[PDB]
Design a protein around this ligand. Structure first.
Ligand SMILES: C[C@H]1c2cccc(O)c2C(=O)C2=C(O)[C@]3(O)C(=O)C(C(N)=O)=C(O)[C@@H](N(C)C)[C@@H]3[C@@H](O)[C@@H]21
Ligand SMILES: C[C@H]1c2cccc(O)c2C(=O)C2=C(O)[C@]3(O)C(=O)C(C(N)=O)=C(O)[C@@H](N(C)C)[C@@H]3[C@@H](O)[C@@H]21
Ligand SMILES: [Cl-]
Ligand SMILES: [Cl-]
Ligand SMILES: [Cl-]
Ligand SMILES: [Cl-]
Ligand SMILES: [Mg+2]
Ligand SMILES: [Mg+2]
Lengths: 207, 207
């Protein structure tokens, strides 16, 4: 079939949903596209190049809140940003593992530079704005990785028997399993953002 | 060599450091131990059982702050807990990916039940105490996963050229690369803990 960059990415993303990241291979990608392995190699040199490409394109296609609204508060920005990033990550199987494989690509430079600029324009030092940005990013990635890898694990083997589960754990597992960890995520996100505002407002005060 | 549970885990942990999680296989484990594949199978049925086992034993051996001190504040507990968990995760290559592969094992039930009990005894509902616990866990796992997967990626291929890197990103990457993300982690951790205290103290007040 067609092997322009866009069509190769569509095919790889389709495969990632069928196989997960551990089982995606350039060999299965060639089979999906109806081509021989040496033909694919011209286009895609190895799995790492593919995964670097997917990490960028997933956000390009599906992460719609990279940039703040005109007049948006930094608190509202981090909230809308984190929600949009979580969604984009959860859209593909093993999405958070796909993202973690790289730091900002050249194609993202403009976007992430503006993010950093925006924090600094709202009273943060670059260092403190970068710590806020990183905290949000990592909190969100860990939350999504736990969701996703819980699915992976379950398809091999069932959860343990609650013959043995003590009461609060039973109840807690039932709690993290009533939605797809959204409540836990949104509650933790507000905690994080307030934590940051307390720090920013304190200036040089012992706090 | 010896194939009691303990010696099998020592050998697998040694292999994980040599190969990383993606490349650890029951075949290379058999070679390390000097045994045939069918002999290993008696002891270790597949990679998933092995990885579930490693996730538990890494914390059993190297995570020394699972439980609060007598009279410790919940704020001090979450801080010491998170620091000890980060260290235990960073001790082995791809440690955070090893952990994420499962939820609490039966062998951990007693520990994690006590953690949940402790929050509830310090003014949190089980739901809010579980959200604090989860937020900390996920923040810490994301921070460690990013560190570790940055190493994995670099061994394939170099970071991009700063011919193109805009100024704040250059400076930010230089910032997340001056220690092993410890400063960013400790700063975000204090933000998270304060965020939680603001929430707990507010009770029913609009906040
Ligand atoms: C500033 C970026 C950065 C700086 C230094 C080291 C890094 O590894 C990064 C990133 O990887 C970032 C992301 O991945 C973003 O998710 C990122 O790339 C992204 C985006 N493309 O819109 C975001 O929305 C960001 N968001 C907070 C989750 C976040 C970035 O802000 C950073
Ligand atoms: C309460 C546990 C839990 C509840 C519901 C769903 C879960 O997936 C979990 C865990 O996985 C926990 C951990 O992994 C701990 O890291 C966990 O197992 C652990 C430990 N063994 O000492 C910790 O120190 C915990 N810490 C906050 C990082 C954390 C646990 O509190 C939870
Ligand atoms: Cl075609
Ligand atoms: Cl073509
Ligand atoms: Cl021996
Ligand atoms: Cl033996
Ligand atoms: Mg990133
Ligand atoms: Mg866990």
């Amino acid at each position: 079939s067609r092997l322009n960059r866009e069509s190769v990415i569509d095919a790889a993303l389709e495969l990632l949903n069928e196989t997960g990241i551990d089982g995606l291979t350039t060999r299965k990608l060639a089979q999906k596209l109806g081509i021989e392995q040496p033909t694919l190699y011209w286009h895609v040199k190895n799995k790492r190049a593919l995964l670097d490409a997917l990490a960028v394109e997933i956000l390009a296609r599906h992460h719609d809140y990279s940039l703040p609204a005109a007049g948006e508060s930094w608190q509202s920005f981090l909230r809308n940003n984190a929600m949009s990033f979580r969604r984009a990550l959860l859209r593909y199987r093993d999405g958070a593992k796909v993202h973690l494989g790289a730091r900002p690509d050249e194609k993202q430079y403009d976007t992430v530079e503006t993010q950093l600029r925006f924090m600094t324009e709202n009273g943060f030092s670059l260092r403190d704005g970068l710590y806020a940005i990183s905290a949000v990013s990592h909190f969100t990635l860990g939350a999504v990785l736990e969701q996703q890898e819980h699915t992976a694990a379950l398809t091999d083997r069932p959860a343990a028997p609650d013959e043995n589960l003590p009461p609060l754990l039973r109840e807690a597992l039932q709690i993290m399993d009533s939605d797809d960890g959204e409540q836990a995520f949104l509650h933790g996100l507000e905690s994080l953002i307030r934590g940051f505002e307390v720090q920013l407002t304190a200036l040089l005060q012992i706090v």
